């Protein structure tokens, strides 16, 4: 018995209740009990002795942290995969200017989300935009790459440049005769 | 007399030099309480914008509290003087005051206090403290240790790094307890980490052609000639700076008296200009 816990707000609480039986039955499948508090707003996990897999506690901790990060329940249970993991990128500390912060976060969004969807498919990743914080998921290579992407966006080189780079990364990694050089001549 | 002083004060109220003259007459008549009275009269009636006259009254009163006062009054006036003036400057004035009065132990405590408080932005505090160290405390190893401490406290920008390193080296060259050999160490390290910095090369050249061994006050013509050769062989020289260095070499060899080295300088300037 070893617990992890954090605190959610009330505007998240409603969706946490109405998506929770999915969550607690998936944690029942992973052999770990979980409860929700209502008068205070905490979720309490606890490793039972019938936990067949050891990483259940850490992945449940990241799971409940992303539930706090207000991500949707299907992706929040898609975290249960072997290679699936999260990451955070705080960008309010990186951008000192408020209007420039708003402009560059909107530039990260792009027109109607086509840019974030292009990034999602180019890295097989997931993106959420929670103000000053960047929740992301997927394979570790995609994760390293999208962290590079968000710091370049806050550095104000444009995502169309970045997507051009990633498609070149993709095709130059798919052809096998060119497999190992510094290909910055093509970038 | 005091009436004469009051007449000249109603003539010129902002005049700090007359203020210190009046309280100095009060020192000569030993009424240190009325001297305090006069000093605070200056601190009130000297006008708002006259910062130099205010600090003159301030540092004079600090001289009083170190000379005839005691620890509690000198610390409270130190607090008030930094409260109403610049902390770094009143601290440096009390430091030079301690240097003058010989109270070198509490001087050292003030020095460690000011390198703690204001070593973050002042390079000059480390300069003055190394000056104290190569002077009367006579610990050059402590001076270079506090130089390493300075490289810890500061950033590594050009001004702070490449200005405290040559100012410390100049102190090494100018103090007989400072070992111009260690100054040459510092300068060699400077021109190793930045060999493109010909103004720093020039400053080394000035420092060797000036009074390097202050224990007996010549320069050293052998290493003068060798460093001048290295200044000729270092890459990156614009022809203006090259001509200036050849002129400086010629001037020093005229000061030396060796016409053979003079004509060597002329011939090597010719073959350098041949390009």
């Amino acid at each position: 018995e070893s617990s992890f816990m954090t605190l959610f707000p009330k505007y998240r609480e409603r969706y946490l209740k109405d998506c929770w039986p999915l969550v607690t039955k998936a944690l029942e499948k992973h052999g770990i009990a979980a409860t929700l508090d209502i008068v205070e707003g905490s979720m309490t996990v606890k490793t039972t002795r019938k936990t067949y897999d050891p990483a259940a506690i850490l992945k449940a901790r990241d799971l409940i942290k992303l539930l706090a990060r207000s991500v949707p329940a299907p992706q929040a249970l898609k975290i249960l995969e072997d290679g699936m993991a999260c990451d955070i990128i705080k960008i309010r500390s990186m951008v000192r200017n408020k209007e420039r912060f708003v402009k560059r976060r909107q530039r990260l969004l792009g027109q109607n989300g086509t840019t974030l969807k292009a990034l999602e498919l180019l890295t097989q990743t997931y993106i959420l935009v929670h103000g000053n914080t960047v929740s992301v998921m997927g394979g570790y290579k995609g994760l390293k790459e999208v962290r590079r992407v968000v710091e370049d966006t806050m550095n104000n080189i444009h995502p169309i440049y970045l997507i051009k780079e990633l498609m070149i990364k993709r095709e130059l990694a798919k052809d096998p005769a060119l497999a190992h050089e510094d290909w910055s001549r093509y970038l | 007399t005091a009436s004469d002083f009051e007449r000249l004060l109603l003539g010129q109220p902002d005049s700090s030099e007359l203020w210190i003259a009046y309280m100095a007459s009060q020192m000569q008549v030993n009424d240190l309480s009325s001297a305090r009275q006069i000093a605070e009269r200056a601190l009130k009636t000297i006008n708002i914008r006259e910062e130099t006259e205010k600090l003159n009254v301030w540092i004079a009163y600090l001289n009083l509290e170190v000379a005839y006062g005691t620890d509690e009054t000198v610390q409270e006036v130190f607090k008030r003087a930094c409260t109403y003036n610049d902390d770094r400057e009143v601290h440096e004035r009390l430091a030079s005051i301690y240097i003058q009065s010989g109270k070198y132990k509490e001087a050292e405590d003030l020095f460690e206090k000011i390198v703690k408080k204001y070593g973050s932005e002042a390079p000059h505090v480390w300069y003055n403290y190394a000056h104290f160290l190569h002077t009367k405390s006579n610990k050059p190893e402590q001076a270079r240790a506090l130089l390493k401490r300075a490289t810890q406290v500061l950033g590594n920008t050009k001004d702070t790094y490449l200005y405290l390193l040559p100012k410390f080296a100049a102190l090494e060259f100018r103090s007989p307890n400072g070992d111009r050999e260690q100054g040459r160490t510092l300068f060699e390290k400077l021109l190793a980490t930045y060999p493109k910095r010909f103004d720093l090369w020039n400053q080394l050249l000035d420092l060797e052609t000036s009074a390097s061994s202050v224990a007996k006050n010549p320069a050293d013509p052998s290493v003068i000639r060798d460093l001048f050769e290295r200044g000729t062989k270092v890459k990156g020289l614009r022809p203006r700076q090259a001509k200036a260095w050849f002129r400086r070499w010629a001037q020093w060899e005229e000061k030396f008296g060796d016409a053979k080295s003079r004509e060597k300088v002329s011939a090597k300037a010719q073959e350098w200009a041949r390009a």
Partner: protein
């Protein structure tokens, strides 16, 4: 008087600028209070004071 309280607030902000001449927002407060002093001193010197 109103001018008396204005010039009182003015000499207070002047002596604080003496305490630290680096406070430029306080210097801006000085320029606004001196503009008000000029205006109301002229407007009540016109009446005879």
């Amino acid at each position: 008087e109103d001018l008396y309280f204005l010039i009182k607030k003015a000499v207070a902000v002047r002596k604080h600028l003496e305490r630290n001449r680096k406070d430029k927002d306080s210097k801006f407060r000085l320029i606004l209070i001196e503009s008000r002093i000029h205006r109301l001193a002229r407007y009540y010197k016109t009446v005879g004071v």
